[PDB]
Write an enzyme that holds these catalytic residues in place. Structure first.
Site, PDB file in Angstrom:
ATOM      1  N   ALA A   1      -2.677 112.972 -42.369  1.00 37.32           N
ATOM      2  CA  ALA A   1      -1.567 113.928 -42.330  1.00 37.32           C
ATOM      3  C   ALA A   1      -1.433 114.539 -40.929  1.00 37.32           C
ATOM      4  CB  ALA A   1      -1.809 115.044 -43.343  1.00 37.32           C
ATOM      5  N   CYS A   2      -0.264 115.184 -40.637  1.00 38.83           N
ATOM      6  CA  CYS A   2      -0.037 115.925 -39.387  1.00 38.83           C
ATOM      7  C   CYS A   2      -0.914 117.174 -39.499  1.00 38.83           C
ATOM      8  CB  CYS A   2       1.433 116.319 -39.212  1.00 38.83           C
ATOM      9  SG  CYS A   2       2.598 114.937 -39.160  1.00 38.83           S
ATOM     10  N   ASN A   3      -1.585 117.578 -38.399  1.00 39.20           N
ATOM     11  CA  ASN A   3      -2.463 118.760 -38.335  1.00 39.20           C
ATOM     12  C   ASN A   3      -3.564 118.728 -39.398  1.00 39.20           C
ATOM     13  OD1 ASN A   3       0.605 119.535 -37.854  1.00 39.20           O
ATOM     14  ND2 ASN A   3      -0.552 120.947 -36.565  1.00 39.20           N
ATOM     15  N   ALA A   4      -4.031 117.523 -39.802  1.00 43.16           N
ATOM     16  CA  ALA A   4      -5.024 117.316 -40.863  1.00 43.16           C
ATOM     17  C   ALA A   4      -6.288 118.198 -40.758  1.00 43.16           C
ATOM     18  CB  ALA A   4      -5.395 115.852 -40.956  1.00 43.16           C
TER      19      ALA A   4
END
Ligand SMILES: *[C@@H]1O[C@H](CO)[C@@H](O[C@@H]2O[C@H](CO)[C@@H](O[C@@H]3O[C@@H](C)[C@@H](O)[C@@H](O)[C@@H]3O)[C@H](O)[C@H]2NC(C)=O)[C@H](O)[C@H]1NC(C)=O
Ligand SMILES: *[C@@H]1O[C@H](CO)[C@@H](O[C@@H]2O[C@H](CO)[C@@H](O[C@@H]3O[C@@H](C)[C@@H](O)[C@@H](O)[C@@H]3O)[C@H](O)[C@H]2NC(C)=O)[C@H](O)[C@H]1NC(C)=O
Ligand SMILES: *[C@@H]1O[C@H](CO)[C@@H](O[C@@H]2O[C@H](CO)[C@@H](O)[C@H](O)[C@H]2NC(C)=O)[C@H](O)[C@H]1NC(C)=O
Ligand code: NAG
Ligand code: NAG
Ligand code: NAG
Lengths: 426, 426
Positions: free
Chosen positions: A162-165
């Site tokens: 995911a984005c900014n995981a």
């Protein structure tokens, strides 16, 4: 003990083909390694294989020349059954809290091993769900802390694409929970997508990207070797070095757990018994995947055709919403902090080991109150959880945001992406 | 030549209906071993069996005590409340745009393709069950098949029905020259039978449910025993008819010359049985399966326990509803035709080649108005479709039934089986 797994694609729609292809691929690794179906909980929407837009009905590929990863995948939770209630109840092993689906839950014991894999999407302190509301870091880490305080597992490995995981664990996941986490990106970075139209040795019938950069790298690695010879740490270092040009692969929780071999959680394909582990791709941003898909759809359609006119209209609606959401947040920020301080405040990132927000209920209220005045954030607007988190940490209350948003949006938007029909994001 | 297609549907729900989903799962294993591709096999199953709290083997479904796990690898296209008339009839017709929920897999058949449809649940005169109300009535099913035969492209079709009064689904309805051959577990007037039931041979003592249905078991185990290139559909018809003769009459409908084809035309053949050339069981009524399951549940539970008290209460509720429904129909009949004349009029069955009712809309209206005054018919009361058909054919109107039912049921029943919460049966 027993090897358990939870595989979840947190998105829906044919343009999100990759997320479900990633999860399908992860199942094939577990199946080949000897991990039993009754111990692998699968969450995937199931709108890809038999989609009108899919050129190969019944087939899902995670690589240009790849195998059909869709064949044999046991779907436990499909459609609107992929939600926070069912996902968090599955992790906790609470069958009585499950609504819809098979009813398969993590009914683990203290010697068992758990591998969780999430693929979709993300935003600061948020991971997507095909059905709103989304999953926020506080609710996910609280569930894991609850599961850790129960002592019904030896160790847990959590892989999040995911984005900014990293924001899902940073300053949240404590030590001694026997949970090791690996993320595609750090708390401030977005994730990348590979295997995209018109760049590799790609089938020209597809207008979608087949995989996510970090997922592709770790998944293809799991296929390449005898997983008894490769540790979780070796995979961490390997995939970090490989993806370095795009994003920073990040570790959280009990890092000593990564000393274990991948076979402890995944098993190993007997076909790779001899393949002992011995210690750039054309990529596009996850945030621009909606724009890119419609562009591909538009470009591939003939001139003057109804499909081309439809795709051109879709692109303007997408761009209009992007501008609306960005311009609303910009105006709100200037109303809130002043014309010149607004950028500095809303773009402030916290240092290593510090959580995104101190008050998670404020963040959720900030998301809701923006959406009631300015309309839905959609997939795009979720990046603004950084702006809302900066408002919460600066002492801004939901009432101050509501007054600024009513001034920023005099009229509720007509754009389909601004629709609150599917509910609020928080 | 062409592709082999299949539609497998278990028309029931609930752990006590274990057998119907076990039957369908077993049929999939036959098709998978014969080389029939997953993208061409549409599966409809509720999916509340494998991971049910009551299942002693999570992830396992058996269609025989010494049997294989028939659940492993079954592709679920329509689960839960997605198994309904809209989705089932749209799948047969190959209409993707009419599908709501599920994978979206439909019969997209070409003129050279072969179709095998298998239904297992449930039945009643001119009715087959659906896990979500309303039920499927012979007029709607035969109209769909007539539409597919007139405008749809295929070479031939074989339809296997496991249900009570299975023959009433085709008798006097399915015309000739459709290339649809149908085989039924029972004729238009008799119920179907159940086997692999608690306490008889060396049956697993953890199970309080039956594992299969007599006709299904017989034909399914037969498909496993031989090279299906050497056995015709006719040979299977005669064989399973002779075997089950003590219990029910296996019946044929439609284009009987189609049964000249080998089973491999529709099912393929397991290469393991290439050399295997083609050359009484303790049974209980399908209508008494709810009674028997609760009896088994009651008997197996310890004395004084909460499970035993609960099962005893469940048995009285079940028996009370049976009596209520039967006594209501008896009173209505006598109100309509007289004290001594009513029984023969309502119990009149159709001669060979005659449909159940001439006015199907009257039948549906009759079912609905009975239920508004006297409560739900449930699984048990569905046998009274014959009583309602006879009322329709005798010139009785819905207004005459309403006045008789209001006199038969002064008070709407409190019994949970009489609940209209899930809607009307028609
Ligand atoms: C194939 O892939 C597309 C995803 O891009 C998907 O389309 C979506 O379908 C939804 C329901 O079928 C639809 O949602 C809405 O639902 C009803 C209740 C109303 O609100 C309608 O306005 C609308 O149909 C949604 O609009 C649509 N999304 C897009 C972007 O077109 C298909 O369903 C996928 N599934 C299959 C099985 O092929
Ligand atoms: C549907 O199948 C039923 C079986 O449930 C069948 O009913 C049976 O019909 C037999 C005649 O074909 C009948 O046999 C007779 O039994 C006694 C009375 C003796 O006189 C025998 O010599 C004689 O053969 C049998 O009793 C009867 N069973 C029942 C339960 O009614 C029907 O024929 C079939 N119905 C249709 C509409 O085709
Ligand atoms: C296990 O099987 C039982 C049926 O025997 C299911 O129980 C029903 O569940 C629905 C929805 O939860 C309720 O409306 C009914 O009241 C229940 N019926 C009974 C008789 O208990 C249950 O849902 C199944 N479990 C799983 C995991 O699917
Ligand atoms: C053992 C356990 O966790 N039980 C909980 C129960 O307390 C709660 O009422 C229910 C809500 O759906 O979820 C379950
Ligand atoms: C080609 C075809 O059969 N199209 C039908 C359409 O006419 C109808 O309006 C719809 C109802 O959902 O089902 C579909
Ligand atoms: C995240 O990685 C980026 C490199 O793309 C770097 O600029 C930043 O310092 C990192 N952020 C944190 C919070 O560690």
């Amino acid at each position: 003990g027993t090897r358990w797994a939870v595989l979840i694609a947190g998105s829906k729609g044919y343009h999100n083909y990759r997320h479900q292809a990633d999860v399908c691929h992860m199942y094939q690794i577990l199946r080949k390694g000897g991990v039993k179906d009754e111990n692998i909980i699968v969450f995937m929407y199931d709108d890809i294989a038999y989609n009108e837009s899919n050129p190969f009905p019944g087939i899902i590929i995670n690589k240009p020349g790849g195998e059909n990863v869709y064949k044999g995948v046991p779907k436990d939770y499909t459609g609107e059954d992929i939600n926070n209630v069912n996902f968090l109840a599955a992790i906790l092993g609470n069958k009585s809290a499950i609504i819809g689906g098979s009813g398969k839950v993590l009914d683990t014991s203290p010697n068992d091993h758990i591998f969780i894999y999430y693929a979709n999407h993300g935003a600061p302190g948020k991971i997507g769900m095909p059905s709103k509301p989304y999953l926020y870091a506080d609710d996910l880490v609280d569930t894991l802390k609850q599961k850790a305080a129960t002592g019904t597992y030896k160790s847990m490995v959590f892989y999040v694409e995911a984005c900014n995981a990293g924001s899902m664990f940073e300053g949240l996941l404590p030590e001694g929970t026997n949970i090791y986490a690996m993320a595609a990106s750090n708390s401030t970075e977005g994730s990348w997508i590979t295997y995209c139209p018109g760049t590799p040795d790609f089938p020209p019938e597809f207008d979608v990207c087949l995989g996510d950069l970090w997922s592709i790298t770790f998944l293809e690695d799991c296929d390449a070797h005898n997983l008894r010879t490769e540790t979780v740490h070796q995979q961490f270092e390997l995939v970090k070095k490989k993806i370095a040009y795009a994003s920073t692969v990040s570790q959280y929780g009990d890092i000593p757990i990564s000393k274990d071999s991948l076979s402890v959680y995944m098993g190993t394909d007997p076909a790779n018994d001899n393949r002992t582990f011995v210690d750039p791709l054309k990529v596009i941003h996850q945030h621009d995947a909606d724009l890119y898909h419609i562009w591909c759809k538009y470009n591939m359609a003939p001139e003057g055709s109804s499909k081309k006119i439809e795709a051109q209209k879709q692109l303007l609606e997408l761009m209009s919403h992007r501008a609306h959401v960005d311009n609303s947040i910009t105006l709100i920020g200037k109303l809130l902090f002043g014309v010149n301080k607004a950028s500095k405040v809303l773009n402030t990132v916290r240092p290593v080991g510090q959580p995104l927000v101190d008050d998670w209920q404020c963040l959720k209220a900030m998301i809701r109150t923006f959406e009631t005045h300015c309309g839905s954030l959609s997939e795009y607007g979720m990046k603004h959880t950084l702006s809302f988190a900066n408002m919460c940490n600066a002492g801004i209350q939901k009432e101050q945001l509501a007054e600024a948003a009513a001034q920023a949006c005099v009229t509720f938007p007509s754009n389909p992406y601004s629709s609150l029909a599917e509910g609020f994001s928080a």
